[PDB]
Write a structure and sequence with these properties.
The complex is a heterotrimer of chains A (9), B (205) and C (222). Helices cover 0% and strands 0% of the residues of chain A. Chain A has no helix or strand. With 205 residues, chain B is mainly beta. Chain B folds into two domains: 104 residues, Immunoglobulin-like; 91 residues, Immunoglobulin-like. Chain B contains two helices and 19 strands. In chain B, strands 2, 4, 5, 6, 9, 10 and 11 form a seven-stranded mixed β-sheet that branches. Chain B is elongated. Chain C starts with a strand and ends with a strand. Chain C is an all-beta fold. Chain C has two domains: 119 residues, Immunoglobulin-like (Sandwich); 90 residues, Immunoglobulin-like (Sandwich), CATH 2.60.40. Classes of the chains: A little secondary structure (9), B mainly beta (205), C mainly beta (222). Chains B and C meet through β5, β10, β12, β13 and β16 of B and β5, β10, β12, β13 and β17 of C. Chain A: Belongs to the plasmodium circumsporozoite protein family.
């Protein structure tokens, strides 16, 4: 999803 | 990904069933969220993943859809549901983009439209402001100056319903005095639906 | 559980401004975080994202190369450095947390700050000019009149009618920031058409910043 990939721990 | 919300505003009464639609310019699977926003406050998340209800959000709110077509339904509107509702996509490789919102507002007085020429007082200052006033009624407003369609020189604003429920919308066309003296017919046209009304005046009359 | 933004205010075009957001009540270092902005006349516009550990950042094209997003997971702060500010960056700026999720994809925005306003204007303080929006003789069950309150800075002005005596039918619009960097708004009222010769109408505009009060009598034309 690149920028939209999971940005969390 | 452009998000389209139609209509931009919608009258309803407490108790009505309300359905809001959101179209996405490409498939976004289910990566769609709905927010509610009231004046002066931050948006609040209602629905995520197009149909999952956020924690603590009441059950009259529900969402459906996949692909390019989504809806938010309020089964029976309550008094604290008058607000602006935004949809937003968070699809893979698509960053984040919002619809322009659907403002759900409380029904009703009589619709009216007025147009005000610049005052001679402001004319002294070398600027002319032409004001078109809309009451209890909402478009989507086009300005015509001797049938010449105007762009980029008009600004719009709207008031908020408060304790009754009357509201107004204003369009202000801003011109130099020189340009104002160079024309005769000034018209404000606003279209609701199948319908347009055009208030005008002749300069110097 | 909250996000509280700070640092907004009036900034000249070309200049720079740093916003900060203090997060509390949650495990901040485990969350991706965003900046989202809102003008009154456009809706919501996404600005930037930063990964939980600072290791990835992405920007909107309209701000790419001018804005920098960063985070301090020790003090639990998000920041936005905004360089080369333009008039069109005028907006409320919201600090925004992503809804937590597992698996490969991000999620919706589940927690928002109250927002901090940044006004990009090269203007100095200046009281308004008030111009009549004169009634005539007319359609809609009523007549209409108003005051045009133009070219002031900063916010706010307050508008009353007949020194507060006339309240019903009164609609005062939000201010709009013109391209000139100055604000303007209108206050209108719908009145019975027969009273045009009898009840005199006066709008009162008080502009606290410039210590200016304007009273304008609005009467019809001929």
């Amino acid at each position: 999803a690149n920028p939209n990939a999971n940005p969390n721990a | 990904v452009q998000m389209t919300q139609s209509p931009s505003t919608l009258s309803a009464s407490v108790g009505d069933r309300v359905t809001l639609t959101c179209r996405a310019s490409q498939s976004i699977s289910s990566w769609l969220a709905w927010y509610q926003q009231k004046p002066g406050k931050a948006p609040k998340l209602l629905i995520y993943d197009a149909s999952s209800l956020e924690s603590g959000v009441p059950s009259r709110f529900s969402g459906s859809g996949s692909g390019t077509e989504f809806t938010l339904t309020i089964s029976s509107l309550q008094p604290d549901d008058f607000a602006t509702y935004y949809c937003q996509q968070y699809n893979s490789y698509s960053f984040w983009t919002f619809g322009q919102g659907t403002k759900v507002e409380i029904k009703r007085a009589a619709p009216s439209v007025f147009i005000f020429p610049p005052s001679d007082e402001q004319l002294k200052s070398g600027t002319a402001s032409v004001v078109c006033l809309l009451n209890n009624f909402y478009p989507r407003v086009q300005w015509k100056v001797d049938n010449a369609l105007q762009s980029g020189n008009s600004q719009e604003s709207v008031t908020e319903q408060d304790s009754d429920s009357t509201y107004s919308l204003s369009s202000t066309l801003t011109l130099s005095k020189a340009d104002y003296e160079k024309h005769k017919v000034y018209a404000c046209e606003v279209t609701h639906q199948g319908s347009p009304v055009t208030k005008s005046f002749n300069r110097g009359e | 559980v909250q996000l509280v933004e700070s640092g907004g205010g009036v900034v000249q075009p070309g200049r720079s401004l740093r916003l900060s957001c203090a997060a509390s009540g949650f495990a901040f270092n485990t969350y991706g975080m965003h900046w989202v902005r809102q003008t009154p006349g456009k809706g919501l516009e996404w600005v930037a994202i930063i990964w939980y550990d600072g290791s990835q950042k992405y920007y909107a094209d309209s701000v790419q190369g001018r804005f920098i997003i960063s985070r301090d997971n020790h003090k639990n702060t998000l920041s936005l450095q905004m360089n080369g500010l333009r008039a069109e960056d005028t907006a409320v700026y919201f600090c925004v947390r992503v809804r937590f999720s597992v698996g490969p994809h991000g999620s919706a925005f589940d927690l928002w700050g109250q927002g901090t306003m940044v006004i990009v204007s090269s203007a100095s303080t200046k009281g308004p000019s008030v111009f009549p929006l004169a009634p005539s003789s007319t359609s809609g069950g009523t007549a209409a009149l108003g005051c045009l309150v133009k070219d002031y800075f900063p916010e706010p002005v307050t508008v009353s009618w007949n020194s507060g005596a006339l309240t019903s039918g009164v609609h005062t619009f939000p201010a709009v920031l013109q391209s000139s960097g100055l604000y303007s708004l209108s206050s209108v009222v719908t009145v019975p058409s027969s009273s045009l010769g009898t009840q005199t109408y006066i709008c009162n505009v008080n502009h606290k910043p410039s210590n200016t009060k304007v009273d304008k009598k609005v009467e019809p034309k001929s």
